[PDB]
Design an enzyme around this catalytic site. Structure first.
Site, PDB file in Angstrom:
ATOM      1  CB  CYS A 236     -35.352 -54.333 -40.756  1.00  0.00           C
ATOM      2  SG  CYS A 236     -35.564 -55.517 -39.594  1.00  0.00           S
TER       3      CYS A 236
ATOM      4  CB  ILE B 245     -30.674 -48.937 -28.694  1.00  0.00           C
ATOM      5  CG1 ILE B 245     -31.227 -49.821 -30.125  1.00  0.00           C
ATOM      6  CG2 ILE B 245     -31.791 -48.789 -27.788  1.00  0.00           C
ATOM      7  CD1 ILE B 245     -31.582 -51.046 -29.889  1.00  0.00           C
TER       8      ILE B 245
ATOM      9  CB  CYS C  88     -37.387 -53.599 -31.959  1.00  0.00           C
ATOM     10  SG  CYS C  88     -36.202 -54.524 -32.891  1.00  0.00           S
TER      11      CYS C  88
ATOM     12  N   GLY D 261     -21.562 -54.405 -27.754  1.00  0.00           N
ATOM     13  CA  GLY D 261     -22.728 -54.788 -28.649  1.00  0.00           C
ATOM     14  C   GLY D 261     -22.438 -54.466 -30.023  1.00  0.00           C
ATOM     15  CB  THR D 262     -24.954 -53.813 -32.981  1.00  0.00           C
ATOM     16  OG1 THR D 262     -25.633 -55.038 -32.861  1.00  0.00           O
ATOM     17  CG2 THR D 262     -24.819 -53.536 -34.519  1.00  0.00           C
ATOM     18  N   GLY D 263     -22.899 -51.663 -31.663  1.00  0.00           N
ATOM     19  CA  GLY D 263     -22.210 -50.204 -31.668  1.00  0.00           C
ATOM     20  C   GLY D 263     -20.977 -50.264 -30.870  1.00  0.00           C
TER      21      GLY D 263
END
Ligand SMILES: Cc1cc2nc3c(=O)[nH]c(=O)nc-3n(C[C@H](O)[C@H](O)[C@H](O)COP(=O)(O)OP(=O)(O)OC[C@H]3O[C@@H](n4cnc5c(N)ncnc54)[C@H](O)[C@@H]3O)c2cc1C
Ligand SMILES: Cc1cc2nc3c(=O)[nH]c(=O)nc-3n(C[C@H](O)[C@H](O)[C@H](O)COP(=O)(O)OP(=O)(O)OC[C@H]3O[C@@H](n4cnc5c(N)ncnc54)[C@H](O)[C@@H]3O)c2cc1C
Ligand SMILES: CCCCCCCCCCCCO[C@@H]1O[C@H](CO)[C@@H](O[C@H]2O[C@H](CO)[C@@H](O)[C@H](O)[C@H]2O)[C@H](O)[C@H]1O
Ligand SMILES: CCCCCCCCCCCCO[C@@H]1O[C@H](CO)[C@@H](O[C@H]2O[C@H](CO)[C@@H](O)[C@H](O)[C@H]2O)[C@H](O)[C@H]1O
Ligand SMILES: CCCCCCCCCCC1=C(C)C(=O)C(OC)=C(OC)C1=O
Ligand SMILES: CCCCCCCCCCC1=C(C)C(=O)C(OC)=C(OC)C1=O
Ligand SMILES: [S]
Ligand SMILES: [S]
Ligand SMILES: [S]
Ligand SMILES: [S]
Ligand SMILES: [S]
Ligand SMILES: [S]
Ligand SMILES: [S]
Ligand SMILES: [S]
EC number: 1.8.5.4
Lengths: 421, 421
Positions: B359, B305, B163, B13-15
């Site tokens: 964000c 996360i 979130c 994912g994003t990481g």
């Protein structure tokens, strides 16, 4: 001298002080670095509005330069340059002595152009200035005379001004101090006059919600605001104001009595610099390339308010874009790098980077700040902030910058960014 | 193996994606890097709200992983991990095969905890989700069914959510799309329900003027807003909501019919990770030190996360602070550096740096963004921005990140800061 270049820095202000340290660090013991400035002390300019309302004293924001630069090997001459001969590469000082240079870095900042508006000089009338600590102490003295004998207040920015933040700041803290002294209701009128096309234009076509926030702020304080104004003269303690419309046509004239006033003047280049043939534009600003090198003289560089930056907009009343601290330091850093490069054979390729404007204003418990880049819209960053944290940042930055000016700067300066790492 | 450590990254994912590239670049040809993820494609999460209203398609925001990581020497296994045995250092995949590791980096992100609220699973009722592209396509399908048969809309964030940005974003673009379809007036009611103590708290005690700006935005769109809410169940197409006060006492209960809904669920750790004995807190989040190393197993790291971050506040209805992209990347960068250090004898000293939240939300022509750091007030940076430029930045960042995910990352990632140099 040959093999041991003499580098002179003219002006010990926000750009010049750092430049002297960085120049000396970059060249080392083999080269002479001389700092020449009109005053024998450094002052932290952004604190001047606070001095002007008596919230700060000279001793809080200024200090003697000599011992701090000398312990770094920098020669210091506390004398104003009167003349610069770019052919002979000689600088004539006020006392008549002459200083020769191999490289010259001009960091002389603004000439406050009071002459644009007859009667507007702080010494000729009621319209004061907060641009320098000398002017701000005088402004505060006049503020006290207002406290003794209340009368109309006029604060704002002249035609040709490029530095609007401090006018809003000063209007706000004057209003705040008046309240804190139980003296606000004694004031007949409080007027804000600006050359901006609208409130919060700030010479940068606005940033974030500067317009809405500054408009509401002035209204909250009972300050009546006029835009698109130019002041034609100050006379008999009255300010003659002409207001125009989008097409420069007069839509009204006003005569405002002023017991206490402060208008940010237009900035020009200082006379010793503007007086150098072919060096400057008609405003007295040094014409430089992207490497901070004069377009006429390859051994003259410039940084800070002293350089010329092309307009991107043309307002009904002439206004200019501000030249602020972070961009100034990038100019300085570039000039130092490219001069060193010149000494060592190469052409330095370093530039100022992206145009930006950054500004912080402290209202006491809370501050306002903005960041805008690049100059033209749509921007990559266009932000306006308000809060207690902005106040805390201003306080912190002032402490840091002043300390750095005493301890010396290597230095890729803004690593005040590792508050991340 | 000894002298040739096998490093496994769990979750692409994003990481995880960046982590795989950075790990391989850092270790080189002498070590094996294996990426294991539940899906065979990468998705750009922040674009999911747009998919959920049909402004973007899956193919705009997702792409197959295999060929991109394989050409970098990274092995890719498109299989979900079901079990992790930290003693034997074996990962059991869904199909029953086992993968051994010498180092494991957990980047598995959130389990969407629909089970906290009976009936709230997108597959069990009218309350949809935009957390993943699969969920957002389903949300959009339900949105179309709303267009065919108008009825009440409920959008917001559950108790325990962390979130909140995307809920506000989704409410705003739903309202905007309804207007653009001439369908807005057909909607009986449009309600926003949140566990936040006030509008624009965002799980970070507000940022800039988030409160005033989000409150006004919802009002502008005719969206009625309730805070301090927890949803107790979704049943018979009705949402049962309990609203409390500062001291957790019920001040009212509500039953809201829902034809179309979207509530951001609470996040927990995924089961394969939470299931590892002594690895996680009760939420299933990996307990790590400042170096991203598990406190129990020295050869297990985590980022994104998936890691546990202590609360700093306790709200009437449980809420969490968000873990956003820039901080995630700093976690990843740190984990990669410290693992390499471990391979070469040293203890890596690299940390995540300062807590921050960043964000961006795109409303179409204009965006809203914030930056807050550190976590607790008073902050060093506390800014909220709105404008066309925020929209342009989101569009630009998405294009950049997706391209980087295809071309590979060395890489001290955020040099998307040289828009200055
Ligand atoms: C009231 C005010 C508030 C400001 N607030 C901000 C702020 O919040 N943030 C920000 O980034 N910027 C701010 N600015 C803008 C800008 O950063 C400052 O003006 C800054 O000091 C400019 O630096 P400088 O080096 O170009 O000029 P200066 O700091 O003015 O330095 C010029 C130096 O040259 C000397 N000099 C001039 N002529 C001669 C001569 N003939 N011979 C020898 N020496 C000479 C002067 O004495 C002075 O020491 C502020 C400006 C003012 C006036
Ligand atoms: C709707 C939404 C909008 C967001 N907007 C922003 C934004 O604007 N800015 C910002 O900075 N952040 C944003 N965030 C927050 C955060 O940056 C993202 O959630 C980000 O994707 C989290 O990255 P991650 O690597 O921790 O988890 P993820 O990106 O979710 O990646 C986790 C990966 O692990 C995989 N996985 C899970 N379990 C297993 C298993 N058992 N075996 C194998 N693989 C598994 C998943 O399939 C996934 O590929 C957003 C979040 C969401 C949900
Ligand atoms: C730095 C260069 C710019 C010019 C220099 C300074 C000019 C003077 C600033 C005057 C502003 C005063 O007005 C003030 O504005 C903000 C609106 O954004 C309000 O504050 C509002 O937003 C802030 C965050 O940004 C919140 O923390 C606050 O709770 C909210 O009410 C204040 O209630 C109002 O009192
Ligand atoms: C990124 C995370 C945060 C949550 C996600 C997004 C939530 C949705 C945002 C709704 C805001 C809409 O409301 C909008 O707000 C700003 C006020 O600041 C107004 O805009 C005002 O400030 C901006 C600059 O910041 C100026 O350019 C503008 O001219 C001025 O009117 C708009 O007139 C109003 O329409
Ligand atoms: C794009 C980067 C902007 C820098 C922001 C972080 C900290 C510095 C604040 C800006 C600032 C600078 C640079 C600065 O040089 C200066 O003094 C003249 C200020 O006055 C207080 C400033 O507020
Ligand atoms: C303190 C530094 C903040 C970074 C700001 C500059 C550009 C990056 C924007 C933030 C962001 C990041 C980091 C990010 O990783 C991400 O994807 C998950 C976003 O979604 C679009 C982001 O908006
Ligand atoms: S001034
Ligand atoms: S300025
Ligand atoms: S300014
Ligand atoms: S400024
Ligand atoms: S969601
Ligand atoms: S988030
Ligand atoms: S968020
Ligand atoms: S976010």
């Amino acid at each position: 001298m040959r093999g041991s270049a003499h580098v002179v820095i003219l002006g010990a202000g926000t750009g010049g002080m750092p430049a002297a340290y960085e120049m000396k660090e970059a060249l080392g013991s083999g080269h002479e670095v001389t700092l020449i400035s009109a005053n024998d002390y450094f002052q932290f300019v952004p604190s001047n509005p606070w001095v002007g309302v008596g919230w700060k004293e000279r001793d809080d924001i200024a200090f003697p330069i000599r011992h701090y630069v000398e312990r770094k090997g920098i020669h210091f001459i506390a004398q104003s340059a009167e003349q610069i001969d770019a052919e002979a590469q000689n600088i004539t000082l006020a006392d008549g002595n002459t200083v020769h240079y191999d490289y010259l870095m001009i960091a002389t900042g603004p000439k406050l152009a009071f002459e644009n508006v007859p009667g507007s000089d702080p010494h000729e009338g009621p319209v004061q200035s907060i641009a320098t600590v000398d002017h701000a102490e005088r402004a505060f003295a006049e503020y006290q005379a207002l406290l003794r004998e209340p009368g109309p207040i006029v604060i704002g920015a002249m035609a040709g001004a490029s530095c609007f933040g401090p006018a809003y700041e000063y209007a706000m803290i004057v209003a705040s101090d008046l309240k804190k002294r139980g003296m606000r209701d004694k004031i007949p009128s409080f007027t804000f006059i600006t050359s901006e096309p609208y409130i919060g234009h700030l010479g940068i076509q606005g940033v974030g919600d500067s317009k809405g926030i500054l408009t509401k702020g002035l209204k909250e304080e009972g300050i009546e605001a006029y835009t698109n104004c130019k002041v034609t003269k100050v006379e008999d303690n009255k300010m003659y104001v002409t207001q125009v419309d989008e097409k420069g046509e007069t839509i009204k004239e006003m005569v405002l009595p002023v017991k206490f006033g402060m208008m940010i003047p237009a900035f020009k280049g200082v006379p010793a610099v503007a007086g150098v043939e072919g060096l400057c534009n008609p405003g007295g600003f040094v014409l430089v390339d992207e490497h901070q090198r004069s377009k006429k003289y390859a051994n003259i560089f410039a940084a800070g308010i002293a350089i010329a930056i092309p307009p991107v907009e043309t307002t009904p009343v002439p206004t200019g874009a501000p030249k602020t601290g972070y961009m100034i330091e990038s100019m300085v850093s570039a000039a130092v790098h490219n001069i060193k490069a010149d000494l060592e054979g190469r052409k330095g390729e370093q530039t100022m980077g992206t145009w930006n404007a950054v500004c912080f204003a402290d209202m006491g418990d809370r501050g306002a700040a903005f960041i805008a880049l690049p100059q033209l819209k749509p921007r990559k960053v266009d932000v306006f902030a308000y809060g207690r944290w902005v106040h805390l940042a201003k306080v912190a930055f002032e402490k840091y910058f002043i300390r750095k000016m005493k301890m010396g700067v290597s230095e890729p300066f803004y690593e005040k960014v590792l508050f991340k790492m």
